[PDB]
């Protein structure tokens, strides 16, 4: 009955055998024909459309429920076949094992808790990042960390799972396995134990406080960077929960010291990767605005990615109107930076200062008090702005200002260069129409 179902590879007959579950249950585990049946169920595991089926999730979960002893051969089979399937197939398998945990109960579920998940995360701690399967392991573990909020009590069983194995993973001397431990830890926070009292609540949150303090006081730069991004996610998610003394101490620690870490530039770029998603914090805007002018020198870095991310927060701040950017940073320092900038950075600066440079709603008087300014006080930044403006905006906006100007005089070279840039603008806007 099942044999022709696997030979035809049809899900309808497998759903029929799902409906007769007790008839499948009557076959003994000791049977070798049941072992061949189990191999054909592994052939069902190979099938991708069965994985897409939610009834597929149902019968695979009850195959896990059927035989406790078969689960270790299932563990060996999925150990053998992680390499073949893709990322969406990995998160599909993760959904299967989430529902497999959910349907399971009793001593079989306790054996699954002592069997499957802890070995997978132990491997994902100890697998090299060179292995592509390692990526699959921590992405399905991140899916589990995302699903722990959906169902209540998941946090407690992962706490009782991670009571042995999180703590020595925190102090793992090897940088890679501690980096993976930090990667799981920063999404693991907060960890809750339901039966414990308020003393133990305050003690465990203070334990997490000193744990993240030591993890951000790591000597390795990449472990520091992962800790930075993690406490950025923590301060974004639950800033209302922490005491304000702890919050002020941690922000002073990550601002007064961390911005000037001359050992590595990309750790400061990781701080830069952090800074937009803390700016959603509405109450702490004066508190962060106290430390906003501390970063004026960071314009003068020699790292490209640092400055690219830096202007990305400048655009983010001008989007959210958190603070006056001209009060934050001098304009002339920005202008000599443009004189020393690169192409995509100058594109982002043109998008940044386009409100300051060219107004579209304001009349020709405002257009000319900015035109005379941008002609006279700097010149090369004006020609870069000419180069990027028609890329950014429509050529009608170019032509209207050209006709305004048509309706520095001491230099013949200046008027010749202005004629040349007018010809350049004409050549740029001719191709549009």
């Amino acid at each position: 009955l099942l044999r022709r179902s696997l030979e035809t590879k049809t899900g309808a007959d497998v759903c029929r055998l799902w409906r007769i579950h007790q008839a499948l249950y009557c076959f003994d585990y000791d049977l070798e024909e049941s072992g061949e049946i189990k191999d054909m169920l592994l052939e069902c595991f190979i099938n991708i459309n069965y994985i897409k089926k939610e009834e597929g999730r149902r019968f695979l979960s009850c195959l896990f429920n059927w035989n406790i002893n078969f689960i270790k051969m299932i563990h060996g089979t999925i150990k053998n076949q992680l390499q073949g399937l893709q990322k969406s197939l990995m998160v599909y398998i993760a959904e299967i094992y989430f529902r497999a945990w959910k349907k399971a109960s009793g001593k079989i579920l306790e054996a699954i808790e002592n069997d499957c998940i802890q070995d997978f995360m132990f491997h994902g701690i100890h697998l090299p990042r060179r292995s592509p399967v390692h990526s699959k392991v921590r992405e399905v573990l991140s899916y589990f960390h995302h699903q722990k909020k959906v169902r209540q009590g998941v946090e407690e069983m992962l706490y009782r799972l991670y009571k042995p194995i999180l703590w020595r993973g925190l102090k793992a001397r090897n940088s890679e396995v501690r980096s993976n431990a930090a990667l799981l830890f920063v999404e693991a926070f907060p960890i809750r134990d339901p039966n414990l009292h308020a003393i133990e609540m305050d003690s465990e949150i203070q334990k997490q406080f000193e744990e993240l303090y030591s993890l951000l006081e790591d000597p390795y730069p990449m472990v520091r960077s992962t800790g930075i991004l993690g406490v950025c996610k923590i301060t974004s998610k639950y800033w209302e929960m922490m005491p304000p003394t702890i919050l002020i101490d941690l922000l002073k620690k990550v601002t007064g010291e961390l911005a000037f870490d001359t050992s590595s530039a990309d750790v400061r770029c990781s701080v830069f990767k952090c800074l937009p998603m803390i700016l959603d914090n509405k109450l702490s805007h004066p508190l962060l605005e106290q430390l906003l002018p501390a970063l004026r020198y960071s314009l003068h870095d020699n790292s490209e990615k640092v400055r690219v991310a830096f202007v990305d927060m400048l655009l983010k701040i001008k989007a959210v109107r958190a603070a006056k950017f001209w009060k934050i940073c001098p304009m002339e320092h920005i202008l000599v930076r443009l004189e020393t900038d690169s192409r995509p950075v100058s594109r982002r600066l043109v998008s940044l200062i386009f409100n300051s440079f060219l107004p579209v709603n304001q009349p020709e008087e405002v257009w000319c008090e900015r035109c005379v300014t941008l002609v006279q006080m700097n010149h090369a930044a004006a020609r870069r702005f000419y180069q990027y403006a028609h890329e950014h905006t429509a050529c009608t906006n170019i032509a209207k200002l050209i006709h305004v100007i048509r309706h520095s005089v001491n230099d013949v070279a200046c008027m010749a260069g202005l004629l040349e840039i007018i010809v350049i603008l004409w050549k740029s806007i001719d191709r549009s129409m």
């Binding site: 001008k318 109107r321 603070a323 006056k324 950017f325 001209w326 304009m331 200062i353 409100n355 300051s356 107004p359 405002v366 008090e369 900015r370």
Partner: peptide, 5 residues
Amino acid sequence: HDDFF
């Protein structure tokens, strides 16, 4: 927060 002028 947009235009300096």
